[PDB]
Amino acid sequence: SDDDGFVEVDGGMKFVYKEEHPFEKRRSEGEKIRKKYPDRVPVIVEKAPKARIGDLDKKKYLVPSDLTVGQFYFLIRKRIHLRAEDALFFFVNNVIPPTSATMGQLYQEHHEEDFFLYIAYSDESVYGL
């Protein structure tokens, strides 16, 4: 007992979506949309702190699970009208996901307790820079 160790609970990253939608309501929607569309995953995308980059009109995406991170990357780039030479990086829990992974795998490994996957985007490869 002298060495009892804390469990470090992971809350994920800060999102406006999480501040504006009560957790219990988020979890209800995440569970239900996964039953409605078992081959898709619900995703929240928001601009990271200090990013200097175009705004993203819509934060909520219902994504076929077999689409890759790289495909979703080009989708988001197009929605913010980024030029090809401009950078865009995604972060899930402060880590850049590999482009070859499926969105389904990223969701399975990293969805939060509300059954959403949370992605932040930035112009920089360091979250918050």
Residue numbers in the entry: -11 to 117
Q: Which of the paper's sentences describe this entry?
A:
The nonstructural small (NSs) protein is the primary virulence factor of RVFV that suppresses the host’s antiviral innate immune response. Interestingly, these searches identified four putative LIR motifs that are located between residues 4–7 (4FPVI7), 59–62 (59FYNV62), 238–241 (238WIPV241) and 261–264 (261FVEV264) in the NSs sequence. In humans, the six LC3-family proteins (LC3A, LC3B, LC3C, GABARAP, GABARAPL1 and GABARAPL2) are key autophagy factors that function by regulating growth of autophagic membranes, recognition of autophagic cargoes, and fusion of autophagic membranes with lysosomes. LC3 proteins carry out their various functions during autophagy in part due to their ability to interact with other autophagy factors that contain LIR motifs.
